[PDB]
Design an enzyme around this catalytic site. Structure first.
Site, PDB file in Angstrom:
ATOM      1  N   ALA A 180      -2.821   8.468   5.833  1.00  0.00           N
ATOM      2  CA  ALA A 180      -3.934   9.553   5.555  1.00  0.00           C
ATOM      3  C   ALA A 180      -5.384   9.234   5.432  1.00  0.00           C
ATOM      4  CB  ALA A 180      -3.640  10.653   4.582  1.00  0.00           C
ATOM      5  N   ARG A 189      -3.003   4.308   0.070  1.00  0.00           N
ATOM      6  CA  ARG A 189      -3.274   2.894   0.152  1.00  0.00           C
ATOM      7  C   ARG A 189      -4.597   2.409   0.282  1.00  0.00           C
ATOM      8  NH1 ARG A 189       1.792   1.118   4.440  1.00  0.00           N
ATOM      9  NH2 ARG A 189       3.042   2.543   3.291  1.00  0.00           N
ATOM     10  N   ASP A 216       7.901   0.599   3.069  1.00  0.00           N
ATOM     11  CA  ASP A 216       7.825   1.889   3.589  1.00  0.00           C
ATOM     12  C   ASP A 216       7.733   2.830   2.537  1.00  0.00           C
ATOM     13  OD1 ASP A 216       9.643   1.962   6.654  1.00  0.00           O
ATOM     14  OD2 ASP A 216       7.680   1.305   6.308  1.00  0.00           O
TER      15      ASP A 216
END
Ligand SMILES: [Ca+2]
Ligand SMILES: [Ca+2]
Ligand SMILES: [Ca+2]
Ligand SMILES: [Ca+2]
EC number: 3.1.3.48
Lengths: 274, 274, 274, 274
Positions: free
Chosen positions: C211, C215, C175
């Site tokens: 977005a 990643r 996270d």
């Protein structure tokens, strides 16, 4: 029903079902080690809805969980047990907490043999499934014209726990074709309903014939549509074709002939007047 | 480490361990009546260190008390509960006053059910183990990327006493082999340590995986070696080979393979840096 | 790498990237009518490389075509679908003839819903996107320790044409921050490559995260640099800084932080060894 | 009912309910940023059954999903909308696909104010929730002695989709205590049942009063027990106390007074004769 019989659109309709039916993998059912656990090569549970036995070694049993969301009823459809899957069949009953087992075939139909003798025919000749460590005893039976009902005591030898399973055996399905009248068939279902075997407190009722898709499918298709025809503000928004296709997402081949299809319609119609 | 790695002598080191491994009777575990309480025939708790259930019918559970004197830490290693031993499993957690339960395997791996669903997945659907008179309720569930921590409430139905059990579920150990990096595994450990579950104020943490010796052995070996290095004035004197053998006096087969052995040394090393 | 790491100049390297980053108009994305089709105000697809929906009402979707000339590989980077853009999302996969969809985030992280449930969780409960006339069915689901691969069936309801989409879901990116080790992330990549989803025979693989730049940027940057090193006669001449900036011409903000930058270099390095 | 009124065991019984009621976290509901989203500090949805709004920013709304497994009915209980949660209330209706909204209070009771005016009182004075981009219009209304029913048109401005929500407003609940007779209350419920709002095809009916636990709880408790009293082979195995406790596992405080408890019993009894 009128038009379809007239314009003889049964085969058409049934065929459109087979064409529209979903397709899902049956990887496990196809494993080489599970070949003798299947009665028919062409009849396998989908991987996603198959009942898993609660074991590490081999959790495979040819049985499917059919969950009708809207009609609000679950059913486990499975093949008639094999001489080597009787313990698996009963372990499933136990693990899934089923209360009733609906049998729609005779242990011997025509010159073949459609299902094993998985329950004791004699009170004093009980059965012990050593593989799955279960004990099954015939407590009593009520034999009728078109169906028999048995009170069986299933015992988890590993925990000495016991449960009473109601065995509903419709014994007058003809060797060929479907019954000319859904009369007895509908009565049989009502008996099963009235028994409480199909209610939510219990695990899903275990339904089987030989392959667990033709007769078994009619039983569930009929029951479900009848629920719908009574659970919907609308008395006919329920389309049995659509219902069957929904049902097919969970077990392949439900309703194996255009006759069984016509009969299913008969039953729903002739049963909606009940 | 690099030496052993460069000489490729893990396997050799591993076999000497299996050679020196102590050997004790496992009479109770092997009794015919306990056959169904054992997941694996080659994995049993020595009589001298087995956890005894505070019940007269059958006090057996495949679980072992591993008390490490120098590191001052006790662990209970056990197998993943079987369908029939979930109640026994919780009676042990209760009776032994454990605070934490460490699960190092996923309920399903390589297809096989490697462990019964011994805890509730749904807050609103608590579990009742009638044979052991306990109720188990999922209170909370914090799912993280490499592990899930649950907060459970265990209640003795007779006394109405309740306790909060923390369930640490390491969820990313590969179906095959061992982790390439010990980072997440160590963070998991540190996370377990932070909860205070390993505190002497509490009974032994209950650790388990499939057989309760491989991944489980890795967790406690690593933890214990880290305790020693941190405690001993000479962090180098910490012989993990000797630590393991010391542990192997309490439960057989700790650390099932060479790789697991290699992973343990690394874990201790990487963990050594803290 | 060790130099930059030892000098601690990632941040510096990162800011120069943000400085040199090309800058192009994002007129369509910023139109008032598309406000609800954008997850983040500071993340929009340049007009020149944005994916256009083959529809006349509104052809906009926050998605960008990243065509890398030397590496010979094209990627479509997009944001996690919003409740109102799941249909647009699948129309793009269809229209662009993609074979694979790479999801690098979990549906829920740090509490926030970082992505709509754009695909069916249940085989038996397919999804219908009425606005785009597509049906989506989960066919299979192979859950592994660090990722899940699903097999989906996408069907244009008008043409009845169906295609198998492979959905690669990397499920263990923390996270917070980036992975300590790039091992699992690379294995995931290799796994994506093995499926043939990145094959030139197929349209661009659709890659996404929150977005569609952090990643997602990491996945395609790493992949593209590995393609170059493996292709270029001088694996050292592969300047990932230059590769990134080259990618940043197609979609803004690729690689959101220094750590992600550091993780990318490492990934390429560790991956370099194959 | 006889004995309890005689021996006046209502307070006793009700108190045993409050004592036996489950306790689950309400972490989210307690976040500082959600304080103005709660009407009462003492009334919060449990984290496990709370309705999540489909948004990344803040998915919080004080509403709970009550799923009665056996009775086979779901309900969403929520507080009367606040001047700032009207859009959230309607976004929930939309996302959860509810067909009906049951209001058991007056927008103003006593000298306080128990709920916001979240629906348009005038056909020509429609409402536009800009925060959640929804349009709501009064299409028509049928005003009766003890209840009113409105036909509302809810429109997803973001997708121009529209749905018709049935608003059932029981308007004669007394400012104090419960109705002397469950007469109108039971009629109201039957109207809601007959409307089809409580059937499976739709999302769960949205039920609210001021806090969403007292009156709302009676409505659901009554409806559920009546389902049970008709869905069980046994006409009295249904214990409303047990049922209420089951219901409390999903939303705290259902039935806020011993009066509401007695009334709930009245309704079930007086309604079982229907
Ligand atoms: Ca399933
Ligand atoms: Ca001892
Ligand atoms: Ca272009
Ligand atoms: Ca829940």
């Amino acid at each position: 029903f009128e038009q379809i019989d007239k314009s003889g659109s049964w085969a058409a309709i049934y065929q459109d079902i087979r064409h529209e039916a979903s397709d899902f993998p049956c990887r496990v059912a196809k494993l080489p080690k599970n070949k003798n656990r299947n009665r028919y090569r062409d009849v396998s549970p989908f991987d996603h809805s198959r009942i898993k036995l609660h074991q590490e070694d081999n959790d495979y049993i040819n049985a499917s969980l059919i969950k009708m969301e809207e009609a609000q009823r679950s059913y486990i459809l499975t093949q008639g047990p094999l001489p080597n899957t009787c313990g698996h069949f009963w372990e499933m009953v136990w693990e899934q907490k089923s209360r009733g087992v609906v049998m729609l075939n005779r242990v011997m139909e025509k010159g073949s043999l459609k299902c094993a003798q998985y329950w004791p025919q004699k009170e004093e000749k009980e059965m012990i499934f050593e593989d799955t460590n279960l004990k099954l005893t015939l407590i009593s039976e009520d034999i009728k014209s078109y169906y028999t009902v048995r009170q069986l005591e299933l015992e988890n030898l590993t925990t000495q726990e016991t449960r009473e399973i109601l065995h509903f055996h419709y014994t007058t399905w003809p060797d060929f074709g479907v019954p000319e009248s859904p009369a007895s068939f509908l009565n049989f279902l009502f008996k099963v309903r009235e028994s409480g075997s199909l209610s939510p407190e219990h695990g899903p009722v275990v339904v089987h014939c030989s392959a667990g898709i033709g007769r078994s499918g009619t039983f569930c298709l009929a029951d479900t549509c009848l629920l719908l025809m009574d659970k919907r503000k609308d008395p006919s928004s329920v389309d049995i074709k659509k219902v069957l296709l929904e049902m097919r997402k969970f077990r392949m081949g439900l309703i194996q002939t255009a006759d069984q299809l016509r009969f299913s319609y008969l039953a729903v119609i002739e049963g909606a007047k009940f």
